[PDB]
Amino acid sequence: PMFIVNTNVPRASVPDGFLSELTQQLAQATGKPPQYIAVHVVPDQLMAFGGSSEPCALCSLHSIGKIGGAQNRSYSKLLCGLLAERLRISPDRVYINYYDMNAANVGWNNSTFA
Amino acid sequence: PMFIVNTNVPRASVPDGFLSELTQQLAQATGKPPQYIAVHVVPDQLMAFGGSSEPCALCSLHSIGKIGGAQNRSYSKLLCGLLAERLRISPDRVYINYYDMNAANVGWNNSTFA
Amino acid sequence: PMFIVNTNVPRASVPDGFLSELTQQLAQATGKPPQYIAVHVVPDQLMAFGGSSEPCALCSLHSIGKIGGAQNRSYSKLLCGLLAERLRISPDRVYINYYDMNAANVGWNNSTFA
Numbered sequence: 617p618m619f620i621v622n623t624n625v626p627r628a629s630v631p632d633g634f635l636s637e638l639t640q641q642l643a644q645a646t647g648k649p650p651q652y653i654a655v656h657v658v659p660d661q662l663m664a665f666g667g668s669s670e671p672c673a674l675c676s677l678h679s680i681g682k683i684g685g686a687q688n689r690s691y692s693k694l695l696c697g698l699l700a701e702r703l704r705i706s707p708d709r710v711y712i713n714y715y716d717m718n719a720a721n722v723g724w725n726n727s728t729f730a
Numbered sequence: 731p732m733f734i735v736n737t738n739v740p741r742a743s744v745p746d747g748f749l750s751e752l753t754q755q756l757a758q759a760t761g762k763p764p765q766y767i768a769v770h771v772v773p774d775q776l777m778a779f780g781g782s783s784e785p786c787a788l789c790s791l792h793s794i795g796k797i798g799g800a801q802n803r804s805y806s807k808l809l810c811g812l813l814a815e816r817l818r819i820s821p822d823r824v825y826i827n828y829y830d831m832n833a834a835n836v837g838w839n840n841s842t843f844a
Numbered sequence: 845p846m847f848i849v850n851t852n853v854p855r856a857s858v859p860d861g862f863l864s865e866l867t868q869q870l871a872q873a874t875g876k877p878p879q880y881i882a883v884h885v886v887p888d889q890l891m892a893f894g895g896s897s898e899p900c901a902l903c904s905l906h907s908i909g910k911i912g913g914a915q916n917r918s919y920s921k922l923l924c925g926l927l928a929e930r931l932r933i934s935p936d937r938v939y940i941n942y943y944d945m946n947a948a949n950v951g952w953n954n955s956t957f958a
């Protein structure tokens with residue numbers, strides 16, 4: 617699976633260990649081995665949420681399976697939790713798009729997962 | 731809903747009120763309250779359209795509902811209009827990906843919209 | 845169609861001609877006229893793959909049609925080949941999300957492709 621967070625929070629406010637913590641926590645949350653987890657953080661963005669430029673984040677989680685009503689609620693609690701504690705972003709200023717990708721539609725290592 | 735514009739236009743050429751205008755125009759266009767609108771502008775990008783590095787933009791609009799054939803035509807006229815007026819990007823050098831998201835697949839405020 | 849690559853490889857390591865090569869090769873591979881191909885490269889990203897910050901990439905290819913099991917395998921071989929040769933990124937550290945977009949959901953030139 618892969619997780620991306622885009623935020624207006626400045627690079628200096630992203631703590632050491634953040635990508636590692638996302639990697640570990642997402643492995644645990646999704647049940648994908650950590651070797652598979654891709655994470656990507658994009659600070660210093662020009663973004664607004666409700667017309668306000670206070671800290672916010674626009675994120676995505678793509679996975680082959682492990683995506684669903686209850687699971688996505690759980691991921692959102694985990695991830696908003698991390699963004700609040702680590703980046704000081706209010707959970708109500710975070711959106712996370714979830715994508716259940718078909719294996720045929722995910723490329724890797726010169727091929728796809730199909 | 732959330733709107734993202736990625737462009738090779740330089741940051742200095744993005745007008746100061748651009749995020750606020752997008753927010754207001756999208757609230758009007760989608761009928762969603764302005765409090766929910768997220769907007770994200772990413773200038774200075776290394777991109778090409780048809781092999782040319784003249785101004786261009788790659789955009790997305792995600793919404794829970796309010797996505798469809800006629801609506802997307804209307805959004806495309808509105809958004810190309812704004813990109814042309816404010817960023818001086820030709821409409822034929824703009825792509826906008828529209829996504830009709832399920833409420834269960836949009837995380838917000840420690841949960842999802844489901 | 846449109847191709848985006850986000851990578852932690854630094855800007856200076858992206859060779860001259862890279863976007864043109866992607867344009868040409870994607871025209872050949874997808875069959876789409878070169879004039880319609882959009883390409884976007886985002887270097888210097890803060891990312892990890894399997895907990896490691898060695899070179900990696902997260903990519904996407906959106907197309908109206910020309911997406912499927914065999915086709916995506918072919919795209920993946922092409923694109924991982926290019927990322928390896930040009931950016932020195934190992935194929936097993938690349939993910940590519942493939943999207944078969946409905947024409948009504950792709951805006952261009954004040955309207956959509958529908």
Ligand SMILES: *S(=O)(=O)Cc1ccccc1
Pocket residue numbers: 617618648652653678679680717722939940941
């Ligand atoms: S993960 O193990 O689910 C692999 C993956 C899935 C979807 C997009 C990118 C990577």
Ligand SMILES: *S(=O)(=O)Cc1ccccc1
Pocket residue numbers: 711712713731732762766767792793794831836
């Ligand atoms: S909007 O009010 O439609 C909320 C939203 C929908 C989809 C993605 C992100 C945010």
Ligand SMILES: *S(=O)(=O)Cc1ccccc1
Pocket residue numbers: 825826827845846876880881906907908945950
């Ligand atoms: S391409 O010729 O397929 C046009 C396109 C399709 C999907 C997204 C963006 C552009």
